Design a protein around this motif. Structure first.
Motif, PDB file in Angstrom:
ATOM      1  N   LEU A   1     110.994  51.448 -60.816  1.00  0.00           N
ATOM      2  CA  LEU A   1     109.854  51.126 -61.665  1.00  0.00           C
ATOM      3  C   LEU A   1     108.764  50.357 -60.945  1.00  0.00           C
ATOM      4  CD1 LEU A   1     111.690  49.716 -64.778  1.00  0.00           C
ATOM      5  CD2 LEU A   1     110.565  51.936 -64.744  1.00  0.00           C
ATOM      6  N   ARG A   2     109.110  49.424 -60.067  1.00  0.00           N
ATOM      7  CA  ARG A   2     108.071  48.637 -59.421  1.00  0.00           C
ATOM      8  C   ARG A   2     107.643  49.209 -58.079  1.00  0.00           C
ATOM      9  NH1 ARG A   2     108.531  43.216 -56.159  1.00  0.00           N
ATOM     10  NH2 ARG A   2     106.552  44.256 -55.655  1.00  0.00           N
ATOM     11  N   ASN A   3     108.375  50.189 -57.552  1.00  0.00           N
ATOM     12  CA  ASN A   3     108.059  50.811 -56.273  1.00  0.00           C
ATOM     13  C   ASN A   3     107.783  52.298 -56.386  1.00  0.00           C
ATOM     14  OD1 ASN A   3     108.464  48.362 -54.968  1.00  0.00           O
ATOM     15  ND2 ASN A   3     110.615  48.818 -54.519  1.00  0.00           N
ATOM     16  N   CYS A   4     108.650  53.052 -57.060  1.00  0.00           N
ATOM     17  CA  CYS A   4     108.506  54.503 -57.113  1.00  0.00           C
ATOM     18  C   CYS A   4     107.424  54.960 -58.073  1.00  0.00           C
ATOM     19  CB  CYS A   4     109.819  55.156 -57.531  1.00  0.00           C
ATOM     20  SG  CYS A   4     111.199  54.866 -56.438  1.00  0.00           S
ATOM     21  N   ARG A   5     107.046  54.133 -59.024  1.00  0.00           N
ATOM     22  CA  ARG A   5     106.033  54.540 -59.978  1.00  0.00           C
ATOM     23  C   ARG A   5     104.623  54.481 -59.390  1.00  0.00           C
ATOM     24  NH1 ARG A   5     104.835  53.602 -65.126  1.00  0.00           N
ATOM     25  NH2 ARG A   5     103.923  51.747 -64.149  1.00  0.00           N
ATOM     26  N   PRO A   6     104.238  53.438 -58.653  1.00  0.00           N
ATOM     27  CA  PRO A   6     102.931  53.447 -57.989  1.00  0.00           C
ATOM     28  C   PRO A   6     102.848  54.323 -56.748  1.00  0.00           C
ATOM     29  CG  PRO A   6     104.089  51.448 -57.444  1.00  0.00           C
ATOM     30  CD  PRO A   6     104.906  52.134 -58.492  1.00  0.00           C
ATOM     31  N   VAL A   7     103.828  55.187 -56.491  1.00  0.00           N
ATOM     32  CA  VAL A   7     103.739  56.073 -55.337  1.00  0.00           C
ATOM     33  C   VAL A   7     102.685  57.148 -55.572  1.00  0.00           C
ATOM     34  CG1 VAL A   7     104.961  57.995 -54.279  1.00  0.00           C
ATOM     35  CG2 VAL A   7     105.930  55.721 -54.176  1.00  0.00           C
ATOM     36  N   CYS A   8     102.678  57.743 -56.763  1.00  0.00           N
ATOM     37  CA  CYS A   8     101.734  58.799 -57.105  1.00  0.00           C
ATOM     38  C   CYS A   8     101.892  59.135 -58.576  1.00  0.00           C
ATOM     39  CB  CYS A   8     101.955  60.051 -56.256  1.00  0.00           C
ATOM     40  SG  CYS A   8     103.656  60.664 -56.241  1.00  0.00           S
ATOM     41  N   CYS A   9     100.881  59.805 -59.129  1.00  0.00           N
ATOM     42  CA  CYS A   9     100.983  60.271 -60.511  1.00  0.00           C
ATOM     43  C   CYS A   9     102.178  61.182 -60.684  1.00  0.00           C
ATOM     44  CB  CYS A   9      99.723  61.031 -60.928  1.00  0.00           C
ATOM     45  SG  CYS A   9      98.197  60.122 -60.799  1.00  0.00           S
TER      46      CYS A   9
ATOM     47  N   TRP B   1     104.986  61.242 -59.468  1.00  0.00           N
ATOM     48  CA  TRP B   1     106.222  60.474 -59.616  1.00  0.00           C
ATOM     49  C   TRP B   1     106.206  59.603 -60.866  1.00  0.00           C
ATOM     50  CZ3 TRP B   1     108.948  58.041 -54.799  1.00  0.00           C
ATOM     51  CH2 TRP B   1     109.517  59.071 -54.052  1.00  0.00           C
ATOM     52  N   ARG B   2     105.118  58.853 -61.046  1.00  0.00           N
ATOM     53  CA  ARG B   2     104.954  57.966 -62.192  1.00  0.00           C
ATOM     54  C   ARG B   2     105.170  58.696 -63.515  1.00  0.00           C
ATOM     55  NH1 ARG B   2      99.926  56.677 -63.961  1.00  0.00           N
ATOM     56  NH2 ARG B   2      99.965  58.964 -63.998  1.00  0.00           N
TER      57      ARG B   2
ATOM     58  N   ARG C   1     105.943  56.557 -49.529  1.00  0.00           N
ATOM     59  CA  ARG C   1     104.962  57.619 -49.325  1.00  0.00           C
ATOM     60  C   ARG C   1     104.818  58.003 -47.854  1.00  0.00           C
ATOM     61  NH1 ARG C   1     101.560  55.410 -52.780  1.00  0.00           N
ATOM     62  NH2 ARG C   1     100.372  54.523 -51.037  1.00  0.00           N
TER      63      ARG C   1
ATOM     64  N   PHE D   1      96.636  58.009 -56.862  1.00  0.00           N
ATOM     65  CA  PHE D   1      95.907  57.107 -57.741  1.00  0.00           C
ATOM     66  C   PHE D   1      94.571  56.718 -57.122  1.00  0.00           C
ATOM     67  CE2 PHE D   1     100.399  56.030 -58.711  1.00  0.00           C
ATOM     68  CZ  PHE D   1     100.421  56.597 -59.971  1.00  0.00           C
TER      69      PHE D   1
END
Ligand SMILES: CC(=O)N[C@@H]1[C@@H](O)[C@H](O[C@@H]2O[C@H](CO)[C@@H](O[C@@H]3O[C@H](CO[C@H]4O[C@H](CO)[C@@H](O)[C@H](O)[C@@H]4O)[C@@H](O)[C@H](O[C@H]4O[C@H](CO)[C@@H](O)[C@H](O)[C@@H]4O)[C@@H]3O)[C@H](O)[C@H]2NC(C)=O)[C@@H](CO)O[C@H]1O
Lengths: 254, 137
Positions: free
Chosen positions: A22-30, A32-33, B113, B122
């Protein structure tokens, strides 16, 4: 890697620790998020982890939270059954002869109804009290869970006398704020039992529901002393004390 | 007591049928049907598949065998999970996927990444995406 099917990408995410996911894999890309925030990720996490059976049959307003509550769900009391002597208990009062451990069923005592339990703490001829102070956030229970969802906190303890001597059992369980201020208090009347009793173990349990927001600590204390002023350990015996935070909330903010 | 599987590029592998059965999609192929052909699997991944299937011909953590076996380069690992999906060897799929998840552990939203090389999707909503659940992790 994003060469992979959506279903397969989901299966990889299943095997990732949730706080990581949640805190790492979600801000990887849309790409993934969007998948991580998909309810079927968490349902299948619960499925695989065992939290949920395919005959699940009970609604949840949120599966991410529900998943965490189930994963964290565990007894927060350390050394509850006197297997490590007296470790990680704080001894608020140690009167008479000291707090002491003793194998079941002990002199003039009965056996504990759970075959798993072997030893018990026991108290003496003046006030013996021990306690623990559960920091809720350090155990993984984050703030907005405690204030906005308020999962039922359930507390239990077990206590028996010796047959040949009377005594008194006391227990306090409190939910304290970040300031160590009491916001809910289980303070049953103290129990005195007389001499020549059946020495039976007795469970005490209370469930905190819809407590105020701001609980950051659960404080758990118990002990006692005899009521004949006898050298040795004729005060009450206690074992198998638990504090567990269940998956039931009182407040489903969505 | 064997069958012959044939890879996308022609190479024929002969295998006992009990091992081969672990692929659902060729247990079903076998209900219908001289070497059965698999044009989605090249010879190399076909072997690593039957190498693993023979190792579990008769059967939490990851086994050590499955760990040494999966110490392959990253593109082979991805072909391997795609083959596991294609062939519906539900065991191989979980071991290989679990492995990819362990590459994911410990790495930042950028460090993930990098080691897998996807492009940043993003704009500055990463702030809206880290903090959304990082508020409590
Ligand atoms: C703080 C302080 O120093 N206070 C002292 C008192 O301790 C003392 O009073 C005596 O205290 C002891 C324990 O401290 C008592 O002994 C226990 O007695 C019971 C039974 O008592 C009667 O009943 C039996 C009949 O069923 C008779 O056999 C017996 O003699 C008594 O008439 C026993 O159950 C206990 O023994 C059990 O436990 C011990 C371990 O605890 C085991 O070894 C045994 O196997 C057994 O199962 C105890 O022996 C004693 O009764 C108290 N005496 C009196 C007269 O009350 C007191 C004396 O002045 O002084 C205080 O200030």
């Amino acid at each position: 890697i994003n060469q992979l099917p959506e279903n397969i990408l989901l299966e990889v995410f299943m095997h990732v620790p949730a706080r990581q996911l949640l805190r790492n894999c979600r801000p990887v890309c849309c790409l993934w998020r969007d998948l991580i925030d998909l309810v079927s990720l968490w349902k299948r996490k619960c499925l695989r982890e065992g939290y949920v059976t395919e005959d699940w049959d009970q609604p949840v307003s949120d599966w991410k939270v529900f998943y965490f509550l189930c994963s964290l769900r565990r007894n927060l009391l350390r050394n509850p059954c006197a297997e490590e002597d007296m470790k990680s208990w704080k001894i608020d009062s140690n009167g008479g002869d000291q707090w002491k451990v003793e194998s079941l069923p002990g002199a003039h005592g009965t056996g504990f109804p759970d075959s798993k339990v072997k030893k018990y703490f026991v108290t003496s001829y003046d006030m013996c009290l021990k306690s623990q102070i559960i920091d809720l956030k350090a155990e993984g229970y984050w703030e907005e869970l405690l204030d906005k969802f308020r999962p039922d906190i359930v507390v239990k303890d077990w206590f028996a006398p010796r047959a040949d001597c009377g005594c008194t059992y006391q227990i306090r369980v409190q939910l304290a704020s970040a300031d160590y201020l009491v916001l809910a208090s289980f303070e049953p009347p103290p129990v005195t039992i007389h001499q020549w009793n059946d020495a039976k173990w007795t469970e005490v349990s209370h469930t905190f529901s819809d407590y105020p927001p701001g609980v950051r600590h659960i404080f758990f204390q118990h002990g006692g002393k005899d009521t004949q002023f006898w050298a040795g350990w004729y005060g009450p015996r206690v074992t198998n004390s638990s504090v567990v935070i269940s998956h039931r909330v009182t407040r489903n903010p969505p | 007591p064997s069958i012959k599987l044939q890879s996308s590029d022609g190479e024929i592998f002969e295998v006992d049928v009990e091992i081969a059965k672990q692929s659902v999609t060729i247990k079903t192929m076998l209900e219908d049907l001289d070497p059965v052909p698999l044009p989605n699997v090249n010879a190399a991944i076909l072997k690593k598949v039957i190498q693993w299937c023979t190792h579990h011909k008769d059967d939490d953590d990851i086994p050590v065998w499955d760990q040494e076996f999966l110490k392959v380069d990253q593109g082979t690992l991805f072909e391997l999970i795609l083959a596991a999906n294609y062939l519906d060897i539900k065991g191989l799929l979980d071991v290989t996927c679990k492995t990819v998840a362990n590459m994911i552990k410990g790495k930042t939203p950028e460090e993930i990444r990098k080691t897998f090389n996807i492009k940043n999707d993003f704009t500055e909503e990463e702030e809206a995406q880290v903090r959304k659940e990082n508020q409590w992790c």
